[PDB]
Amino acid sequence: DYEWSGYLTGIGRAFDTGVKDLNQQLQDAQANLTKNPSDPTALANYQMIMSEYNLYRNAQSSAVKSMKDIDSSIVSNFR
Amino acid sequence: MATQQKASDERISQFDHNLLPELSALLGLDAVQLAKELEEEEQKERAKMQKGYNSQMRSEAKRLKTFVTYEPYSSWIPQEMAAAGFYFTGVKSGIQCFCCSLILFGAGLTRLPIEDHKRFHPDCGFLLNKDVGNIAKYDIRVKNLKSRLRGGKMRYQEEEARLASFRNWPFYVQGISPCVLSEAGFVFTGKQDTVQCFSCGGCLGNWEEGDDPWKEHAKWFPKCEFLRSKKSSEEITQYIQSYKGFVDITGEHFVNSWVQRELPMASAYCNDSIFAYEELRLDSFKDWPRESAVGVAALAKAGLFYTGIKDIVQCFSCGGCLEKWQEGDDPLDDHTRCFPNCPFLQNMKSSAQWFQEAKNLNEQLRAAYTSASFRHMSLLDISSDLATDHLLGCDLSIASKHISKPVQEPLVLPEVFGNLNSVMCVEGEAGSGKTVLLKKIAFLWASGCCPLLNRFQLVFYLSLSSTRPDEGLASIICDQLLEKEGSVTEMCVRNIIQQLKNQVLFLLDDYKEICSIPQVIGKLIQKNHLSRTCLLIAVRTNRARDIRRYLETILEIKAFPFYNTVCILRKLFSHNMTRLRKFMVYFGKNQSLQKIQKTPLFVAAICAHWFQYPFDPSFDDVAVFKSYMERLSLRNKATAEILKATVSSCGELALKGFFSCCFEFNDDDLAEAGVDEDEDLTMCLMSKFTAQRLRPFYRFLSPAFQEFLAGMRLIELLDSDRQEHQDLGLYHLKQINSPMMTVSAYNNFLNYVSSLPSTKAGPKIVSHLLHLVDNKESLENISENDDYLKHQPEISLQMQLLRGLWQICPQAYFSMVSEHLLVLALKTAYQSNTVAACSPFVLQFLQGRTLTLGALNLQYFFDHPESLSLLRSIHFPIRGNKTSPRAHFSVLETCFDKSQVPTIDQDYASAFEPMNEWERNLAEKEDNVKSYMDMQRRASPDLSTGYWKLSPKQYKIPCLEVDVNDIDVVGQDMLEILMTVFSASQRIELHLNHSRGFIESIRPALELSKASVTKCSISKLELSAAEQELLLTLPSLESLEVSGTIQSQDQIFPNLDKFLCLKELSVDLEGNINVFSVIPEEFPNFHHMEKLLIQISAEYDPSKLVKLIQNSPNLHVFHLKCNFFSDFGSLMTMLVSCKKLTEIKFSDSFFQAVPFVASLPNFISLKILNLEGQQFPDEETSEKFAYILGSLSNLEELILPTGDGIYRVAKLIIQQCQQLHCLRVLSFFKTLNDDSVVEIAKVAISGGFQKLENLKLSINHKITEEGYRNFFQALDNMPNLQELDISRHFTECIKAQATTVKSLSQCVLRLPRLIRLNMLSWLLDADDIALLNVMKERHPQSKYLTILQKWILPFSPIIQK
Amino acid sequence: AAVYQHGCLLGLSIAKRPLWRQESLQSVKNTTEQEILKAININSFVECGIHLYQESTSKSALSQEFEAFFQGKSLYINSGNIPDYLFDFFEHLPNCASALDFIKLDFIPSRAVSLFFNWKQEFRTLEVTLRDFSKLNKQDIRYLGKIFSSATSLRLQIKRCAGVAGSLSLVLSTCKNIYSLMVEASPLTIEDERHITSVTNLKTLSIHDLQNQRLPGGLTDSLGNLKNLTK
Ligand SMILES: Nc1ncnc2c1ncn2[C@@H]1O[C@H](COP(=O)(O)OP(=O)(O)OP(=O)(O)O)[C@@H](O)[C@H]1O
Ligand SMILES: [Zn+2]
Ligand SMILES: [Zn+2]
Ligand SMILES: [Zn+2]
C-alpha cells in the first residue's frame, strides 16, 4: 500500500546530475592545460570533454523545454 | 450607443489566488512562480490582438463552431463558454467576448466561464441583459410575430415610406443598408432586428452582414405577390435553389406548428438546459405531491424544477438539491442559503379528419417524451433516483463523411438539425452514445423550446430490437410510445404519413438488417421518394453496409473529448478534490492515455468505481479497465461459453498483436484467434471497419485497452494447468528480454499485469523480472524496436533522457533500472499475495546490491528485515543548490595556439569553428536550463512511511554512503534525518565535495556516531580549526583522502598518528607543500597500508615512504607522482615484497626506466600498468620490456611509455598482445609508423585484442595517409571496441582522399559496438562528411555513434589556397 | 545463367542512340557488326536480369542465383541518363554488382557521384570516357575524383576534349588505381606528358593525333619509365 508507483520518476534529475559532473571535468581539464600550455594531449583532452559538455547541454535544453511546456499546460487548467 | 466601451481592467486579471501551494506536491515545481510567468505572457498577448464588437460572432450558434479546433484537454466545455458570450481565438487557446473584449486564457475547476466574465468586467452589456443582439443556439429566421403594423396597404407602398421606418435600426446590424431592405418591401417592426413585408406580413429577423434580402424573401414566403411582380419566376427559383440548409420547406412550415413556444431573450444566464426557461420549469411541476409550501409559481422563479423524484426540487443552474423539501420554507432563501454562489441568484440580486387525429397523436407523443421516464435517460447508470438532469450538457463529436469522395467535415448540432431531409444515418462504435443522441432529439422537439426542430409535427422514437417484419406502424407505436393499444389505427397512421411527408420524423434505433424490419418501415427507406418521410437510422460500424446505398453522407461519431470526461466527473463528484486533481495531472503528463476515454461507456466505468470508494484520495489508472469489463457482464450476459470464450479468444488476438506491434488485424488473423466477428460481445471490445476499401480490417477499442487484454490473457496462460496452453505463457513472457524496454515500451503492460489477480503467474513473472537485470549479459542489453513509440510521444520523450543518461554515466543508468525492476517484482508479489513464494527470488537478487535510501520504504524490508544484511550499501546523497560559477571559456585557449595557425583551403575550411559563436550559443542554452531547475523542489526524505520501520533491533545497515555535493548549511529537518540515519548504520563513509561549512552543522550527529565513520574523502573544501579537531576524534577511519586546497597549514598532517586504523591514504594538493615533510616519522610503522596515492615533491632520500611500503605486504595500489627523486632503484626493489600489487602508476620526471624493467618480472598480479609520460631511450631496455609484458598475463590496461626504444621495438609489443587475453585498453604515443601500425589489425585477425574496448592512437604524426587506408582495410574483427581515436595536432592536419574516406566508412561498419570515433585535424569536404553521416544510419549502434571532427580554437584559420 | 548463345543479332542495332559513339569515336577498325551488337545484346540481357530481381521482392533470399547470372557480364551507364533501377541494383544487391567486369560511364551530374560514391564495395573494373569537355572546372575534378574511387582497376579515356589540357596532371594525380590511359586529339602540355610517364603501374597507353612536334622532356623524350607497359 506504500505508494507502489510503477514509473521511472526523477530521470530529469538523474540526467542533470550527470551533466554537472562533465562541467567539473571540464574545469579540471582547463587547469591541467593551464599548467602545461603547450602539451598537445592536454589540449586534445580539453576539447574532447568540452564538445561533450556542449552536446549534452544542447540535449537537455530541448527536453527541458518540452517538459516545461507540459507542466505549464496543467497549472493553466486547474489554476 | 457604445456597445461596451472596450473592457480594460488594468490588464491584471490574475485568475489565481495562492491555491497552488498544494499542487507543487504533485508536480515537483513551484506552481506559484510558474503561474506568474504565465500571467506575464498573457498580458503581452492581449496587447497584440483586436478588440471591439464582433457582429459575426453575435450568434452563439457560430461561437460554438469556432471551438472545433479547441484543444481536447481543458476544464471547460465549449458549450458552457459559448453560452457566456465567448468565442475561440487563434492565440494560445484564449477566448474573447463578442460584445466585449476581455481576453481570457485557460480554465479552472472552481470557476465557470460566466463567473469570470462578470468578475473581470461586471459592466458588460451582455451580462447586464442590455440589447446586444444575442442569438440563441437554436433559432430560425422566421419569427412568426403574429402582429400587423399600421395600414401598410397604402402607407408603405412607397420606398420613402418604408425607408423612413428605419430610424432606430440597431448598431449591431448596421452592415445591411435599410435602403436595400426597403427596396425589397421590408419595414422595421420596432423589435430587436425584425422586419415585416409590407404586403405579405411575413417577418424575418437575425440578419447578418452579407445577407441578400431578395434571396431571403424568395426562400421564405415565395408566393408573395410583390416578389412575383418584381422578379421573374426563374429568378425566384434560382434564389431558392441557391440557398443553403433547408431543403424542401418554407415559412409555412415554421408557423401554425403544434409545438411552438415563445422564448424571452437568450439571456446570458442560461447555461445549457431546457429548464433555464421559467415556462418550462413551471409548466412541468405537475407531479408535485401536494407538499407544504405549494407556491409553485414562486418556486419556479427560484430557478427550481421537479426532477420526478418524490420531493427533490432541483436547480437548473447548480444541480440536485433541497432533498426532502423542508416544509413551509421559502425556495429563494433556501436556494441562497444552501448555494450562495449560484450565478442565477447573483443575477437576481443585481437586477380534415386526419388532421384532428394527428393533433391528438402529437399531444400524446409530447407527453411521453417530457415525462420523467424518458428524461433521466439512465446516463452513466447512476440510479433510478439521484437526478441526472444537469448531466445532459455534454454532446458528441460529429463529422460528416461522404460515401463516394474521401471528404470529411466537422459539425455542431445546430448545423445538423437544419439539414435533416430524407434518409440519414449515424454510425459509431458500441457504446458511442448514439442511443442517447436520438432520445435527446425527441426530447428537444417535445419541449418546444428548440426552434429549428419545431417544423416537425410528429416525431417517433422507435427501437427495432425484436419487432417482426410484418407489424404495421400502429401496432408498433402503440407498444413503444403510447400507454395503451388505442388512439390510432393502421389506416389513420398511413393517412397521416402521406399528408405531412416532410413534417414527419422517425428515429430508428437498434437497426440490424434491411430484411428484419417492419415492411411498412422498409418501404420508407427503399422507396423514399413517394413519401419523403425523414428517417434517421443509428447503426454500429459492424454493419452499416446495408443502408449506405440509400445515403449521400453519413454522420460519424468521433472519440468523446477529454474535456467532456472532466466535466462529467466534476459535476458528479467534487467532494473529493484531492482525487480529481490527481486525475487531471495524470492525464496531463501521459498525453496519449487521454485516448482511453474514447467511448462514454468508459466514463460510466469510472463513475461506477468512484461511487464505491468516494473518500479514497488516490487515482488507480487501471480501475477503469477492471470496471469496464465487469459492467460488461451486466449488459446481456452469458458467462458460460460466451463471455469467457469471447474474452479469451480476443485476448489471444491482442496478446499476439502486442508482440508484433500490430494494433490492426485482417480477417485471417482474426479467424485463427477463434474470434467470431458476428458475436455481440466481440463488439464491445473490438470494432470492424468496412468503409470504402478493397478489404475490411478490425481494430480494438482505444489501444491501451488492447494492452490490458493482452496482459489478462498472459496471466490466464501462466495460471492454467494445461501444459499445452501453459508453456505458451512462457513463450510470450520470454519475448520481454530487454531492460531498456521494460522501463518504457512495456511499462504499461507490466503495470496492468501486476494488478490483475493471479495464482501461479506471480512467482513465474517475478522470477523473470529479477533475472533480466541480474547478470551483466542481460543488463547491458540496450535494445529497442521504435515501433511501439510511434503512437506514444510521452515515451519517446522519456527515452530521450535514458539514452543520454547511459552515455554520460552508465553506472547511474544501471543502478536506476535495477532498482526499478526490483520495485515491479515486489509490487507484483504483494498485489497477488504470493510473497511467500516470491521472497526467495528477491533475496537472491538483493545480494551484493546497492540501493538508495528511499528503497528502504518498501514494505518488503519490514516483513523480511534480514534481507538488509545481504546488501552491499545504501546510497544517501544530499545536494542543496550551491552555485558553481562557470566553465570560464576563452580565457586559456586564447593564449596557446597563436602563431601556429594552419592554412586550410576553401573547400575544407569547415574543419575549424569560431569560439565566439560556440560560447554564445552554449551560454544561451545553459541559461534556459538553469531557470527551470531553480523551480524544482528536492523534497527531504520521508523516513516514516514504513522506512525500515522496525524500531531497529537486530539488523543494521551494513554500509551507508553519504554523498555531500554543492551544499553548505543543512536545516533542522536534515539534522534530524542525518542523525536518525547515521545511528542506523554500522559503517559510515563521508564523501565531501565542494561544501564549505558543512562539517560544522552536522557536528551533533557526528559526535554521537564518531566510531562508526570509516571513510572521509575531502575535495575542494576549506577546513576550519574546529572542523579538523572533529575529524581527529574519528578513531575508526580506515580511508582518508585530501584532493585539493589544503593550504591551511593545519594539524591534519602533524597529527596523522591518531588514525591507527588507516589503510588508505590519498594526497593530491594543488598547492605544493612537499607532503611527508609534515608527516611524523612514527607513521611508517604498524600501519600496513593497502593504498598509497601520493603527489609528492622535492623530497630527498624519503625513507619514510620506503619504510611505509616495506611494512605494507598487502599494498594493492601504488601511485607516485613527483619531481627529482632519490634511490629510485631502492623503491623498485622494495616493491618486490608487495606480491598483491594490481596497479602501478608512475607519471613524472623521477622514473629511471632500467631499475623498473629489472624488477617488473616480479609483479604477476598487475592489472593496470600506466607509464604514460615516461621515456625509454634504449633499444635493449625496450626489447626486454616488450618480452616481459607477455608474462604479465593479467594486464587489462596497458598504457605505453614513449621514446625511441619503444618506437624501434614496437612490433614486439603488439605481437605479444595475442597472449594477453584480457586487454581492454591500449594507448600509444609517438611509437608507431606506417609499417608497424598495421600489425594491430593483423593481430586482431589472428585472434588477439578480442576484448579490447579502447584503442588510442595519438601517434598519428609519424604515419602518412597510406598507413590509415591500409590499416582500415585490414581491420575485420574487434567485437568489443567502443572508442577508436585516430587524431592529430592541428599543426599537422591531414587531407583525406576519396579512397581513404570510403575505406573508413567501411571499417566502422565492421565494428558493431563502436560508439565513439575521434578525427580531430582530419580534413573532409562537404561531400565526404555527407557519406559518414549516412553510414551512421546503417550502423548497429545508431543514435549513439558520434564522430568528432571539429576544432574550436579561438582564431580564424587562413583560408586561401 | 546457363544461356550463352546470342541468337539473332540482325536488327535492333538502333538500340543505344550512340550507335557509333555519336559518329565520333572508333576508326575504320572494329566495325564488325558483331563487335558492337554483341555488347548491346548483353546490355539488354543484364537489364532484364535486374528487372527480374526487382519484380520478385526476394531481397537477400536469392543472393546466390542473382550473383551467378551477372558474373562476367557488362553494363553501360550514360552519366546524363541514369535510370532509378540502377540505384536499386547497386544498393540492394552487393556482391553481384562487383561480379561485373565493366561498368562503363559516358560523360558531371551529381547523380553520377551519388550513385558511385558509397560505402559498399569496389567494382572489378570501372571505365570512364570523357567526350564533351571544352572546359574543365576545379569542382569537376573534385567530383570526378570521387567517381574513380569505387574501383579496383580504372581505365580512362579522354577523347577530343581540349578543356582537359594543362589539367590532366591534376586528374591523374588522384588515380592510383589506373592501368589504362587513352587520349585522342587533346592539346596536352609537357607538364601533362611528364605526369603520364610517371605512372609506372600503367599497362596500356594510347595516344592519337598529338601534334606538338616539340617535346622537350615530354612523352617521347623518354617513355622508358613505363616498364610495365604491354600495349
Ligand atoms: N451525453 C452523455 N453523457 C453521459 N453519458 C452518456 C452520454 N451519452 C451516452 N452516454 C452513455 O452511453 C451509453 C449508451 O451507449 P450507446 O448510445 O452507444 O448504446 P449502445 O450501448 O451501443 O447500445 P444500443 O446502440 O443498443 O443502445 C449509456 O449507458 C450512457 O451512459
Ligand atoms: Zn464581456
Ligand atoms: Zn413578402
Ligand atoms: Zn442554483
Residue numbers in the entry:
A (entry chain U): -8 to 70
B (entry chain A): 1 to 351, 394 to 1403
C (entry chain B): 510 to 616, 644 to 767
Copy text verbatim from the article accompanying this structure deposition.
The NLR family caspase activation and recruitment domain-containing 4 (NLRC4) inflammasome is a critical cytosolic innate immune machine formed upon the direct sensing of bacterial infection and in response to cell stress during sterile chronic inflammation. Here we identify Bacillus thailandensis type III secretion system needle protein (Needle) as a potent trigger of the human NLR family apoptosis inhibitory protein (NAIP)/NLRC4 inflammasome complex formation and determine its structural features by cryogenic electron microscopy.
The huNLRC4-R288A mutant preferably forms a complex composed of NeedleTox, huNAIP and huNLRC4-R288A in equal molar ratios. Cryo-EM analysis of the intermediate Needle/huNAIP/huNLRC4-R288A complex, without symmetry operation, revealed a structure with two apparent NLRC4-like protomers. The quality of the EM density map allowed us to model one protomer as huNAIP with features of BIRs which embraces Needle, and the other as an activated huNLRC4-R288A interacting with huNAIP forming extensive charged, polar and hydrophobic interactions. The huNAIP ‘Key’, Leu736, interacts with the ‘lock’ site in the activated huNLRC4-R288A. Similar to the huNLRC4 tri-protomer at the NACHT interfaces, three pairs of salt bridge bonds were formed between huNAIP Lys569, Arg574 and Arg590 and huNLRC4-R288A Asp222, Asp104 and Asp125, respectively. A non-protein density located in the core of NACHT was modeled as ATP, forming extensive interactions with the Walker A motif, and WHD subdomain. The huNAIP has a unique feature that the last eight residues pass through the insertion domain (ID), and pull the ID toward the huNLRC4–LRR, creating additional hydrogen-bond interactions between huNAIP Asp949 and huNLRC4 Gln675 and Arg678. We call this region the ‘lasso-like motif’ because of its shape. Needle C-terminus was anchored into a narrow pocket formed by the huNAIP N, BIR1 and HD1 domains.
